Every structure is written in structure tokens, then in C-alpha cells.
Amino acid sequence: SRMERVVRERMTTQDVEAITPQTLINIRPVVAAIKEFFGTSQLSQFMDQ
Amino acid sequence: LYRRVINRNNRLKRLIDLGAPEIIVNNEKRMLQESVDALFDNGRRGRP
Amino acid sequence: APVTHIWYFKGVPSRLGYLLDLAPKDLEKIIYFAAYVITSVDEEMRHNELSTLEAEMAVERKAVEDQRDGELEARAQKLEADLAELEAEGAKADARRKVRDGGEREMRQIRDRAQRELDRLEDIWSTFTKLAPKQLIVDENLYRELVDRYGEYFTGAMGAESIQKLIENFDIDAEAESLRDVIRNGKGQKKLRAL
Amino acid sequence: KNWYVVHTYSGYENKVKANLEKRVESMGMQDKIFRVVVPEEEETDIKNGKKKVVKKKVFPGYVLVEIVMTDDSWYVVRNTPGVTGFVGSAGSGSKPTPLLPGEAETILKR
């Protein structure tokens, strides 16, 4: 959803005929969310061995 | 919390000694008041 | 610029509001730049100038009425010309009947703006009649009109700099004996408020 | 069409101006938002011929825009990628407060 908001907001400020799917997409929010879940979270717990 | 107050005070001083319109000075004064209030008690009014 | 301590205004109760006799919502609006307040208003000039003031605004209102009836006369002669050029001959008289109805609509439309102007003048007069310190005045346009038409005889602003002025022009003794008089001979809930 | 003041992040004023012009020309609303300008000065910052002028901002963080306030111009202008919000809003912040004739004149003169 964060990436979708970014692409929707940036689709209206760039010039046409130079718009490609690779120039509208930002990966940072997704990796940030993934690394925030798998790290500082209350449900992904340190294993007891 | 100290740095925020110092930055707002410096911007207010520079804008006052420049001949700024009243609306902008009022906005800066409101923002300085909010910053000091957050310094003394964070979360009492508005959002933390 | 002066600021206000959070402890003495955002408490339960508000010690600043208890000292100044102001609702906490009024304090919050004044402090955070959302409404004006009257710090001081001079009275002797009002008392010795009311007659001239009333004369000036009566003259202005009558001039507005004179302009309005001037437009009425111009539109009346235009409508008379239209009726003369239309009603007398084979031109559609149904159109002129609905034109008469729309003409009545036109008096109503012009009296709308006339009433707007008259109401603005009379409510400015009403506000200037009843103006006391520590009275919050919303609708900033009224403040511009008051501060330009009768800019003297009173002062006020918004922010903590305008509350410092209210605190400085404060008399502890008079309010103290006033509260003690209210408690001595009184009942209901105003006695509870005084307590 | 009265002038209005918009608050943006510090250092993003020129980018906000460019993006707002682009969204004026692209989204479609061209008869609502007319002109934008960032008040600025060109101080004499020089060093032995080698000029070093950093664009002198008289009001850092503010942008001037001429616009007719409908309920869609407020939406398009406020959601530009970089502005924080409108200024001058009083009385529950229903609508922003316009500028003054002489004030706009003197700011647009320099």
C-alpha cells in the first residue's frame, strides 16, 4: 500500500513517453516492512534450544 | 527537545527582523509555543 | 516571544482560567492563534462620542439607501421603456407578464444586498456598543472592521502576549472582595463557583 | 484570484514549485491555479571573483501561490509531494486566509 501510494503520486509529475514500469516502482517500503517484522517484533521470537 | 526550541527561536528572530507579513510570524510563534510545550510535557496536548 | 507554561493551563482545573475567569476552550483558542480577545476598551470617549458616531452611521445608511433607490429608478425607467416597446403591440404579452414577475424578483434581489449591508452596519454597531475586556471575538473580518473604523478607544490581539497584558492589568483585591461578597450573601451554584 | 501562502519542508521549496507547476499542467486544472513564486533574493556572496551565492530566502519554508479556492483546488494544492499544509487557517481551519493587496504588492516588487 505504501508503494502504491508513492507510484500513484509520482505518475502525475513525470513526462509521458518516458514512463516505464521500472521508473514508477520503489522497493524500499517493502524491504523496510519485511525487516521490521522479522526483527523488532513480539511474535518472531528467539528460539530456545 | 532543546534543539527544536533553539531552531524555532532562531527562525522567529530572523523573520521578525526582516519585515515579514503577520500571518507567517503568527505561524512561527504558534510553532515555537508548541515546541516549548512539548519540551515541558510531551503528549499532554495533541499528539506525542 | 512570550510563551505559556503547560502546567498552569492544561491542568484539572485550569489555574490560569480560574484566575482570569475564562473557559479552557477560550484559553486554548486564544493561546494557539485561533481567535482574538479585547485586552482593554476605553469608555469615556465612547460616552462622549456616541452621538457623533450614530450620526455618521445614519448618514452612511441613508446614503446607501439613496444609491439603492437610484438603481431602482434606473431599472424602473428601463422597464417602462421595455413595456412601452413591447406591451403596446403584437409582442408576446405573456413574456411581459413573466417579466413583471421577474421584476418583483428583482426588487427582492436588490433588497437582498441592501439588507446584507444594513445588517453588517447594525451588527458592527451592536458589537461596538457592548464591548468589554476579556471578551473573545471570533470572525476576524469583524475585527478588521472594528480596528479600522474605530481603531482607537480599544486594543487587543491574540497569543500569550495578549494574555500577559490581561494579567498585568489585573486587580487582586477588588476581585477578592467581590468573591467574598458573593459567598457571604448568595446561594445556588454561583456560591459553589466562588468557592 | 488572491495570493495564498503554503508551508513546505525546509529546502524543498523549489522542488515543490516545480512539481506544482507540473501537476497544474498535467492533472488538468489550469483555470484555477495561475502562478507560483518562491520569495527570494540574490545576496552578494562572492570570493575573489569566484561567486558563492546561496539563494537568499527571505522566508525559508514558504511558497506563494495564486488560486481560486474551490473544494478541488484545495485538494490538489495541499497534496503536492512536499508541502506540509496551508497557513493562516483560523476558526476550525475551514478555509485559508488570503493575503493583503499592499503586502502582495511589496513582496512581488522585490
Add this chain to the structure above:
DNA sequence: CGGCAGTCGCCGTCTACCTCTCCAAGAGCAGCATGCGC
């Protein structure tokens, strides 16, 4: 004016000790350094 009842916010909710992990980053503004062109 004068009661009046819902409502909304603010206060509080046991002691001592052990082990582990994780704690703003991308964007932006100059300031040059070297390559390329006439």
C-alpha cells in the same frame, strides 16, 4: 435562569534476580576534478 444527566478525561494497578536481540537512512546542496569540445 436553573437544574440535569451524560460524558470525557485523569489517576492507580507487589518485590528481588537471570538470559537474549535491536536502537533513521535516503535525499539534497554545494565544492570541486577531470574529461571533452571548439
Add this chain to the structure above:
DNA sequence: GCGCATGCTGCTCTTCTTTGCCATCACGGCGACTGCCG
């Protein structure tokens, strides 16, 4: 041979709060308050 242009790189901040984002928050006691009905 000299001037202009663009990328390594010092270098010091900057990070909001609408018509959005945001999703909620026990349980009891207490006290103002505030619109509301009479």
C-alpha cells in the same frame, strides 16, 4: 590551449499531520463541564 559540463564527494541538516493514515485501550473512582431540557 582554455572554458564548460557532470559526477565523486565533503557536509550538514531533515524528517508534516487533510478531504489522510489509523487501529485500537481494561476497569473502577472522581470531578468538572457542557450542551440540553425545562
Add this chain to the structure above:
RNA sequence: CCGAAGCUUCGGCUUCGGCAGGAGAGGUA
């Protein structure tokens, strides 16, 4: 305050070097 090194009259003197906050989860009495 500790260490290293010199002077040391044996009381000490001189040079250099050096730091310790939050959030979350699980557990024992």
C-alpha cells in the same frame, strides 16, 4: 580513582593513558 614510567629527601612530586543509556521477549522464587 587505576596502570605504566621517571624524581624520590620516603611525606610524596611529575609525564602519559582510560568509561557505563532505552525498547521488546522469555524465565526462577
